[PDB]
Amino acid sequence: ELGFFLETGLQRAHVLYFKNGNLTRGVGRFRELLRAVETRTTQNLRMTIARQLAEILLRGMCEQSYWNPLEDPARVYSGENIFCPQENTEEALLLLLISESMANRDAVLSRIPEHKSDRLISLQSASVVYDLLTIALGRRGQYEMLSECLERAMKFAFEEFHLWYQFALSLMAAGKSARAVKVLKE
Amino acid sequence: RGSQLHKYYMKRRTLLLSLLATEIERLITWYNPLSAPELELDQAGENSVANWRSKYISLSEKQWKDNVNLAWSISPYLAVQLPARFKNTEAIGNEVTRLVRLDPGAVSDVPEAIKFLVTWHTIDADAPELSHVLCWAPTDPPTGLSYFSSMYPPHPLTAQYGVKVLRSFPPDAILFYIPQIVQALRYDKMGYVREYILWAASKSQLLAHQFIWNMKTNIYLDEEGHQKDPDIGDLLDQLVEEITGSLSGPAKDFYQREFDFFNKITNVSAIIKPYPKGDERKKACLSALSEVKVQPGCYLPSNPEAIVLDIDYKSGTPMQSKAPYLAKFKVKRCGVSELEKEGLRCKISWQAAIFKVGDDCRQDMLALQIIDLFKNIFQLVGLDLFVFPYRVVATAPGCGVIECIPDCTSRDQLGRQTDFGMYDYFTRQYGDESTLAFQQARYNFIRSMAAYSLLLFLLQIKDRHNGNIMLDKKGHIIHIDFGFMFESSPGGNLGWEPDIKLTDEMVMIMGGKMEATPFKWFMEMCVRGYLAVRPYMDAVVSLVTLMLDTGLPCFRGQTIKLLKHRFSPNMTEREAANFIMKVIQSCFL
Numbered sequence: 001e002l003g004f005f006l007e008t009g010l011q012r013a014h015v016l017y018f019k020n021g022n023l024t025r026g027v028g029r030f031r032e033l034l035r036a037v038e039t040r041t042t043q044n045l046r047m048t049i050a051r052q053l054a055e056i057l058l059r060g061m062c063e064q065s066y067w068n069p070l071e072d073p074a075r076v077y078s079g080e081n082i083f084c085p086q087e088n089t090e091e092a093l094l095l096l097l098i099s100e101s102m103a104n105r106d107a108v109l110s111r112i113p114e115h116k117s118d119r120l121i122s123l124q125s126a127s128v129v130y131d132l133l134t135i136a137l138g139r140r141g142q143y144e145m146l147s148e149c150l151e152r153a154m155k156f157a158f159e160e161f162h163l164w165y166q167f168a169l170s171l172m173a174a175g176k177s178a179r180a181v182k183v184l185k186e
Numbered sequence: 187r188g189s190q191l192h193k194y195y196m197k198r199r200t201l202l203l204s205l206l207a208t209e210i211e212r213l214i215t216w217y218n219p220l221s222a223p224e225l226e227l228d229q230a231g232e233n234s235v236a237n238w239r240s241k242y243i244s245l246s247e248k249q250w251k252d253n254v255n256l257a258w259s260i261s262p263y264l265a266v267q268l269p270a271r272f273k274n275t276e277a278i279g280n281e282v283t284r285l286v287r288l289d290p291g292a293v294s295d296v297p298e299a300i301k302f303l304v305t306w307h308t309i310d311a312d313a314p315e316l317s318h319v320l321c322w323a324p325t326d327p328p329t330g331l332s333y334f335s336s337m338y339p340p341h342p343l344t345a346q347y348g349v350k351v352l353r354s355f356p357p358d359a360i361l362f363y364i365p366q367i368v369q370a371l372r373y374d375k376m377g378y379v380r381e382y383i384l385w386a387a388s389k390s391q392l393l394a395h396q397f398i399w400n401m402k403t404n405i406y407l408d409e410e411g412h413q414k415d416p417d418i419g420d421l422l423d424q425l426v427e428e429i430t431g432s433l434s435g436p437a438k439d440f441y442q443r444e445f446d447f448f449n450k451i452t453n454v455s456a457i458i459k460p461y462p463k464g465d466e467r468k469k470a471c472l473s474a475l476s477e478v479k480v481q482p483g484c485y486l487p488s489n490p491e492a493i494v495l496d497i498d499y500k501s502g503t504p505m506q507s508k509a510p511y512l513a514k515f516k517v518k519r520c521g522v523s524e525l526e527k528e529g530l531r532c533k534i535s536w537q538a539a540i541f542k543v544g545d546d547c548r549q550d551m552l553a554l555q556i557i558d559l560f561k562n563i564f565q566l567v568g569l570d571l572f573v574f575p576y577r578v579v580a581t582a583p584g585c586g587v588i589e590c591i592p593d594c595t596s597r598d599q600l601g602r603q604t605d606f607g608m609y610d611y612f613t614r615q616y617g618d619e620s621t622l623a624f625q626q627a628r629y630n631f632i633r634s635m636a637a638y639s640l641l642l643f644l645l646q647i648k649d650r651h652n653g654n655i656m657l658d659k660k661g662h663i664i665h666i667d668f669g670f671m672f673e674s675s676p677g678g679n680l681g682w683e684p685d686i687k688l689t690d691e692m693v694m695i696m697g698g699k700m701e702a703t704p705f706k707w708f709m710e711m712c713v714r715g716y717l718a719v720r721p722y723m724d725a726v727v728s729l730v731t732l733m734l735d736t737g738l739p740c741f742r743g744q745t746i747k748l749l750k751h752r753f754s755p756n757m758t759e760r761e762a763a764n765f766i767m768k769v770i771q772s773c774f775l
Contacts, residue, residue, distance in 0.1 A: 109342060110342075111377070112377065112381070113377050113380075151318070154318075154320070155342055155343065158346060178291060179291065179318075179321070182321045186320070
């Protein structure tokens, strides 16, 4: 129940690659890591590797330098009914969606009885994942989905200016008015 | 295409006719409570209205849900206000709930529409979607507190809304609703209530004093106190240690002075017990009372809206009983905010205080809250009923402070002095029945008696003998000693005592015959009061539900089911009037 050597011996090798500039090998390693069968003990590691892949996959390459995971530049999930990634946006959005779906479960519900570290960490993770989602979705101009996703994350917000302001500004773009007016008043 | 407009007008004509018939029936029901065959109106119109009611009362489940769709197409407000005009069918509620779930943004009137959306499922606790309650206007505090009770499973959004609604009221209302707030901590698997309590105590000043005084008593379970509850006792200890010490400066000095003065004035009862009955106990009590000095800035706990001036050092008089004594005070009435601001810098009458040791003072507090709410309802509606809500505050396990009504006159003492009926007493006191003062005294007696009988029937209060009724100088009657209620019944639940106590002398006061005009006045006043008090069931149910876990002997499990039944929430006005008239006369001889 103690993962101690896999994470080090694998991540630090492609960390050295990043220090040297071997981006393709690291991307392949991340892909073969994520395409493997899920492990319940390493769900947090899956979260971390997915976030690290999503952070770099939007600001480190170009359109013509993209390749599908099924070709070169134990058990593995396969089949013909699966959704094969096509472009960077599709797989990035899928990774962000699954990360958000799993990260809602592990929320500490903003307990604040006497301790605050866990809630602060959870809030930071939620903020960064939703920021990545909104910056990914903004460039294509699908504002209704963005508004719905922001409305989904309103459970955490109690005394936060940033989330309320982002939701209010997203509401106006879609077209709705009355809810936008009320959130603006708040 | 004339058919479209034809049906378009016919449907609305039918709906308007139904609504007008219902309104006319309600108004004519309110006109005269009794049948009153002497009074009469046009016959053909009444017959037509009755025929239309009989015709439209036979509709099935269909052709009635469609009416809700038409009403919604007309205006959402009319559709929302539809179940208020009671229809004996549950399909209307389901259809309204479905429609409001499909579009919640069309309605923003909180007092009624909020309950059609909040409870997605009563106890199922599923489907957490589309619930955006962060825009509704504030509602009454009783509705907000309902989300922390056993009625609804916990949820972050409901708790957040309940916290939001409570933070938009003046401090006096929160002071009035103090006892229910602390009990919410038991079912508070969350902790928003704790943060709210800390913020409120930091903001106001008297609220902190009320909180500490209330919470100091509730840590234990027994009257004397030797067993802390295993549920929230440690949390209460942590809270009481946290809140104190945080305050500093003039507020700390004022709190210290008030608590020191109260302790000095309280230890006398403990000191005086070892001395037996006699003049020695009285003189020792007088000396102990003279020992204490008057400290400016203090205030009585039972009346936080007045400032004490001095102490009468000769009013000490212990009563029979445990060493409870009595004292008198000279007080000045200023207010609340002025008192609060004057307590950090340094119209006069007399008051009497009664202290008790070793007795519980919570059921009386709940009864007083209910009585005050009923008095507010009666004053708002515009009727003429009289009730006297004497204040009472508990401050220690088994110890509390109870106010005394001015010019106390016990019925038992008067009966011992006279050993005759009250009719002779009030004939001697005021004069013959033909004088002017006798009529006013009788009118005040009717005013008090009707309201008190209605309250006694409604709350199911037992153990009402001649030694508890109180008579004032004007002629009103006031009840006291509400220890037994709901289910508790001295004697072994024998039950031969009637719901309303009606002896022969009190009947003879109002003429002694059921056909007398004052008797009709009393009957119509009772019927009108019962009709007026009905539409406030939810607040009473919410207030009484939250105090079940305290483990008082009165509660036994089936209180809510029986209490909700006595309001008859599925009957029309005329049927309810007939029911109350039948139940009133059943207790007469």
